[PDB]
């Protein structure tokens, strides 16, 4: 009866009147655990439905003329775009914050920091800072391998020198993910087959600094795999991070499953991985050991975020459940002693975290 995680259903979005046809990747955004925005169509003009996660029973509904809407991860500040026209608004103060019109249409965007929305067009990736120039700086041009792909994620490392775009497409009756990992310092990309990814900061024992880790999961033709590779130059005085590559388990009845989401808990150094069919996986960031697996959802959890109050992962499925999984802070070392029988990992979990 001892579980190394803890489960929570925060809210059901059908309780707030959200029709499930607009509960999808194209219409629902969740850039952090504080807000959910949904674009709807009541009448023939559009609406946006903003849900405060600290007051979930009082949503607000404003009319819009935008094709996407993303709330800032920390304030009630909304970014809206209509093709090439981009705008950022303060909701409560009713104040326009900035605006820019592009030359190519922005097909995908996402806040990567408190100040920066990353913009993706059909051939390039831009960073649009709030406190900066008001023109978006071009970061890199998009590789040929990501052409004709549905762009699903963009993530950066903490100091924004390692950038990663992710798209998926259907090749040979399979959802093949194509990633472009870009280094700002050397100005070179690498086309990578991957499905879900995140960067992380990990301090090794015997190290004065942190190492910048790149973590990605993939289901290719050789099965499911999770890689934990250090990117960037290691500082002298620090040992290099030893490269990990472990298997990602899929059951025999789920050969049409693949990873769709990854968040990393920086407090506990734990990789959370969600698959398309609803399975959550927990890996240790240092060794890659699969701690725990369970199917937590019946529908596809299509957008995730960090859940900072519990240092976990929070997500929305297509039914409209807002679900969260985090490490149970009392139970995860009494799970690895008895149920997992890994005593060398369980007390090396204790020094750096507990």
């Amino acid at each position: 009866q001892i579980l190394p995680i803890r489960f929570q259903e925060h809210l059901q979005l059908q309780n707030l009147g959200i029709n499930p046809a607009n509960i999808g990747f194209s219409t629902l955004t969740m850039e952090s655990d504080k807000f959910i925005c949904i674009r709807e169509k009541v009448g023939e003009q559009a609406q946006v439905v903003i849900i405060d996660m600290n007051d979930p029973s009082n949503p607000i509904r404003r009319p819009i003329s935008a094709d996407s809407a993303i709330m800032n991860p920390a304030s009630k500040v909304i970014a809206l775009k209509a093709g090439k026209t981009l705008q950022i608004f303060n909701i409560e103060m009713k104040s326009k914050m900035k605006a820019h019109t592009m030359t190519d249409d922005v097909t995908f965007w996402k806040w990567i920091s408190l100040n920066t929305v990353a913009l993706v067009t059909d051939n390039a990736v831009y960073h649009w800072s709030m406190e900066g120039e008001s023109q978006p700086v071009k970061m890199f041009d998009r590789h040929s391998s990501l052409a004709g792909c549905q762009i699903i994620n963009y993530r950066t490392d903490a100091k924004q020198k390692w950038l990663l775009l992710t798209g998926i497409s259907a090749q040979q009756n399979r959802v093949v993910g194509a990633m472009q990992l870009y280094s700002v310092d050397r100005k070179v990309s690498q086309p990578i087959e991957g499905h879900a990814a995140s960067f992380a900061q990990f301090k090794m024992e015997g190290n004065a600094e942190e190492s910048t880790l790149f973590c990605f999961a993939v289901r290719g033709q050789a099965g499911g795999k999770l890689h934990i590779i250090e990117v960037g130059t290691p500082p002298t005085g620090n040992q290099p991070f030893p490269k990990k590559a472990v298997d990602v388990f899929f059951p025999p009845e789920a050969q049409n499953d693949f990873p769709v989401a990854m968040q990393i808990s920086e407090k506990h150094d734990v990789v959370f991985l969600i698959t398309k069919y609803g399975y959550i996986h927990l890996y240790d960031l240092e060794t890659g050991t699969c701690i725990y697996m369970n199917r937590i959802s019946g529908e596809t959890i299509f957008v995730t975020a960090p859940h900072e109050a519990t240092a976990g992962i929070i997500g929305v499925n297509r039914k409209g459940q807002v679900l969260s999984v985090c490490v149970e802070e009392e139970n995860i070392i009494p799970y690895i002693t008895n149920v997992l029988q890994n005593p060398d990992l369980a007390l090396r979990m204790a020094v750096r975290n507990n």
């Binding site: 280094s183 990309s189 690498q190 790149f214 590779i229 590559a245």
Partner: peptide
């Protein structure tokens, strides 16, 4: 404009432990 591509990370795990 083409992107310049190369080998940033090694995805291969070695088949021999040379210590």
């Amino acid at each position: 404009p083409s992107p310049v591509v190369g080998q940033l990370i090694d995805l291969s795990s070695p088949l021999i432990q040379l210590s």
